Assembly symmetry: D4
Homo-oligomer: 219 residues x 8
């Protein structure tokens, strides 16, 4: 288990992270964490590692691109003094290009995304014990569907950044791909983006695997 | 793992099982399974065993004792033709005796509880592939707290019926007990009965382990 | 144009047709026809052919497959004595197979779809002046996407029934296909099924062109 | 088609234009354009000219007279940098005289209307590729009904202004007159002002005809 | 004045009479009589003739034509044992012909109107002390407006039935006509049918004058 | 009729005047005047004197004592530039003494009331054509009921002030007294203060009598 | 004290007893007993006599006269098998005569009141351990106020029936009278009927003293 | 009765005191005092000592620890100029330690609690006739349940402070202990903290006993 007793773990990203969490604080008291993968991660950690006393804060906000994360980074991340920061961003950065392909101000192309996300990591890295970078995802099995294909570009950048900054790394797309061998997207998500409970569990488990979670701990 | 491809798994119980599930069907759209252990079990099964094709139904109803289960058993269990039936009942059977001590007809005492549960299990067994009996529970660490002591006794009756009938058995109380060595009830539940997400993960995991779930499949 | 002065045109289908229409009547006040292609068709007919005196009824119901159409056909089509009946069904027939793959009784497979639709068309034909069969559709440009491929097959069945019975025919999918050479589905619809205003104009126009509507009347 | 690829088309006027559009932005994302002639114009343009990538903004506000448009012109029009501006105003300017004929501060008489509307055009004309001036309307067939008669005065001014400023021009009254040969107003509108879907379609089509829209484009 | 101490006066009609009255009783608490002419009549009678002890019932129902009155006449008039019955019906009888011209079964044409009203008046007369017939009305000053012309004809039928049967008669249209020489309809009503408070005072006064009300009692 | 063509008549007082009127403006557009005696006065005036074009403003606010009227006099009266001002105040000034007889800061005793109300008149009188002073009231027939008795003291002061300032005068209590000869208060009002429709009509008619209203005008 | 361990005490009456109690059961969860004297009695009994094990049921229904009690007596009293039955009825029996004086069938006059109450008491007596008859009341200090005088008479009938049948007797009016020597009704109640918390404590105490409650138990 | 005619008694604490009282004022007008022990205390005092004219203010706010009371003391207590101040605080100070045992900023340990509460008393004592210090409570009969045990530490501090400052003193735990000999907590409260009506009555009576209340006053 990479996360240590007493420490503060802070999630940030878009509606996948937000899931109706409490604003502004995103912390603690039953329901504050929203009802998706963040809440599940904390549930399992508290079920299985109750003694760790891990504080978890949810700063997801629906709609955010990486450009929005940067605008609020100081207040929502730096000022929180986390020990661990988890980031999952990119879906909206990419989606806007496909759902509002003529309101370009709304779009965030790959080169801006990459540099902005590197900027978040590099500002944050000296301040915390660790960063976990979760790729974005599109719940779509064909690699050549245009939005899937774009999304994969952004996920490869995320991996590149995690390798280079020695951040932890979660490839959320690879986790969904495995399940898409059996299920069509409609069974897993709304509009290839908004996951069901099962989708949130896929994300939660992927995240927990990367931080060394044990389902039954090693005596 | 005990549940098999193509099988229908039906859950029944009180509000712990219910958790806002869709009525009457308890099946059939994102959200239909409610927001507690039953949804978590299904999410995990689908995350790790997508190909199993498991059909899941939530027949929990808030407020139910075993007497209420018996009155709707034909419509809500038998007529559903489940392959597996999971039962968790007893919390209200017991709690009425402590929160409305002078309304005696609302109480389901041990004798009515054993007889009626036993009966529902024996009628159901010849008609399904398997039955999982989950004990009731009370989120309280002191065995000699009157309502905990009584809840443990009711658990002992579930355990016998489960051996008497060769059903799978989940001791939900032992699962909570482990965590209560670190946490006080108020950190885990409201009013020592209604668990948090964490509480519901304890339950979901206890069930999953009993049916042979692997967090990572061996291969 | 094919529809004539004084005639009753009745539309039936699923949520695409429904769009919030008034229940049960689906006729009879500003708003009664709902907010999608059916209202747009009526608006255009009235804008360009005010004198035609066309009476229009919306019997769409959200969620319906062809099986549901058959159960209410007598009350909602026959007893209305329409002169024309427009049918667009098949999206849910197909979509249940992909979004609830393990609930098989909710699926309307090809054989049930052809038989039941064919039957409803043959019973209805002797009793009305004309019938317009609109294919179902899926807002997806890749033919080999599983659900699109299956939706195209269902369209082929509508086309035969339509030739088998000499009904007017509207290929809604070809209408969407044209636009999908420029736009990705998310720009046109939610979840590749529920169209925007634009989507509904594509449908309204496809219908209108089939019945001989002129945008400006020749004179 | 007068409107060119990439360009921004901005509608402004009163509740006929507003139709519940999103405030303040009036742009894009499904529903932002409200549910009347503006939304219909954009639907048809996107159905038929998907490749044009036209941005459309709705700045209608219920209740506005031309005096209100001027008070917000800088923020709601100039600062939007439209390429095309469509204006339809006058209904309230006239209606207040007939529904609150003793709260005169509320009224805008013809001479003030004319000069104010000329002022909007003349400020705007050097900034944009084109202006479309839509007359106001009253859904009332008798020319000598006092409010109809007043409304026509204001429409003749609008035409005069469009001729003199070389703006495009839509005579919304003439479009309604044609339909009023067959339908009494009650069938088309609420209170001779608030049009049905069909009324909004009349407006939409009138507007599209003036900008060179083709229902089926010329190959 | 025509109504007498201890008598039950029952009003029936459409939304003009209804005005939010309590259902089904239309009697029996502050507010039960609704917020229009019927409440104003009762208020005035009580202000000026408190000692008369007049019991008043409001059986108006929004949307009703004379056909609807006939279907509920037994339960809502006869069984109430009124001493006086006031009827104002015809607005919807007529308005359906203009706002839904192509839904012919919703129309109550002159022949059905005279027969059915006449019939309801003759059956009712032997059973009560008196009947007041109020003409329908339309808030429109031009006699040759089609719907006004038709409303006047319907008024003429009420007048004959009223002489044919020796009932009191209130020409609501003449009362509105007087005011329309100064005000345009929009100052008095919504959509030329639903009056303001002022409109309802015109009606209340017209009724009151017909039954011999004094504003200040002679003494 | 004391009120002249074109002039502005402004009502102020407490909830009896307020009756849910629109804030802040209290003017015009159907419903703005609330639904009690003010609305009735305007209805009758417009029914009977439509040509007068009288503007009426309602500035009643629930809860006000004369101390509250003074705090808002400049903004709600002076700045409105009325031609006629109607005041009815005192109920709360008195009621607080009986319902909260130990929160004395809330009470306004007779000497403060008198001087404050004189102060309003004297500031206002040089600015307007006329002032109408309506006494407060308590719907209670026994003169020696303590609150009735107090209320009468305040009404005698109001009369004194009207005589001395040559204001018009309406004795609302005397109007209710006449009706209380027949009806117990419960039939007329809620809690001896909040009048029914009939109570509001009593007030309306009393007011209209004082300003020279004719029910049928003198030809 | 008169009520004994293990006994069922059932309260019945009008809104004074009801006070928002749960329907139909009026028993069985925090809040089920409503928010007035009945809940206060139960709270006090439990505060001072926790060990008595008293089961309490609230069958009050707002609006009830004794005629309404009789219509539901079998289902709501007899079938509940109470040990004690407490009745407080008469306020509406009387109040209808004053607030709706001309709706005579809503009135329960003295003769119907004595007969029907007497009858309900005699049928009930053989079947229960005891009956407590609470007089109705009116919050008014003047005996010669018509409705108070009539309420006192109705109280006298309750007192006789109570001696005629050897029932416990609570003079609620004498309890209010004591306090009315200091407070005016408006300080204690709304509309002289609906008491404040204080009002309900007066009632609760009057009941408690009649059944032998000690505030501090002697010991 | 320690509280004297005319004087102002002000309650402050957490949700047990708050009980939905009106903000900010917490005073008077029916409902302003919320619906728990404060309202009950005032009800009984007004029932039994109506002539005392005691003003009671409720400044309870849900969630407060003693740290929150201090932050608002000046505005909510000092500035109110009470004659008597009642304080009951500690539940949240203690609860946070057990329900959010890793958000320590939320906790208030015994030494800070003691000094802060002494600080409130000592600032307040020279300004008022008297202070009543009510211990906090936990509705839990076992002294060694960890939260009960902690709560008792805080109650012993409160007693210590009351002794030392010559404040009046109410031991709310001792009052609940007596009742817990018979009732399990579930019958008395929600989550061992939020009392039923009976629980609020326990508190109310305990408070009244300490200030010399008589149920029947000594003649
Ligand atoms: Cl999002
Ligand atoms: Cl439950
Ligand atoms: Cl608890
Ligand atoms: Cl659908
Ligand atoms: Cl999709
Ligand atoms: Cl408008
Ligand atoms: Cl109507
Ligand atoms: Cl109109
Ligand atoms: Cl008021
Ligand atoms: Cl009642
Ligand atoms: Cl009263
Ligand atoms: Cl609290």
């Amino acid at each position: 288990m990479k996360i240590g007793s007493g420490e503060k773990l802070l999630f940030i990203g878009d509606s996948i992270t937000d899931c109706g969490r409490a604003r502004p604080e995103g912390e603690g008291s039953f329901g504050a964490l929203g009802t998706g993968y963040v809440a599940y991660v904390v549930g399992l950690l508290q079920a299985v590692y109750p003694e760790l006393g891990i504080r978890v804060v949810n700063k997801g906000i629906s709609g955010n691109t990486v450009r929005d994360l940067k605008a609020r980074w100081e207040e929502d991340v730096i000022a929180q003094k986390p020990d661990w920061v988890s980031i999952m961003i990119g879906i909206n950065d990419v989606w806007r290009q496909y759902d509002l392909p003529f309101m370009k101000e709304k779009h965030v192309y790959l080169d801006e995304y990459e540099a902005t996300l590197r900027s978040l990591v590099l500002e944050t890295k000296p301040l915390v014990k660790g960063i976990i970078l979760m790729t974005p995802f599109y719940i779509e099995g064909n690699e050549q569907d245009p939005m899937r294909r774009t999304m994969d570009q952004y996920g490869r950048v995320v991996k590149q950044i995690a390798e280079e900054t020695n951040s932890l790394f979660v490839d959320t797309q690879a986790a969904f791909n495995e399940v898409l061998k059996t299920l069509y997207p409609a069974a897993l998500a709304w509009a290839r983006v908004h996951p069901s409970v099962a989708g949130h569990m896929i994300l939660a488990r992927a995240f927990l695997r990367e931080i060394g979670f044990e389902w039954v701990r090693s005596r």
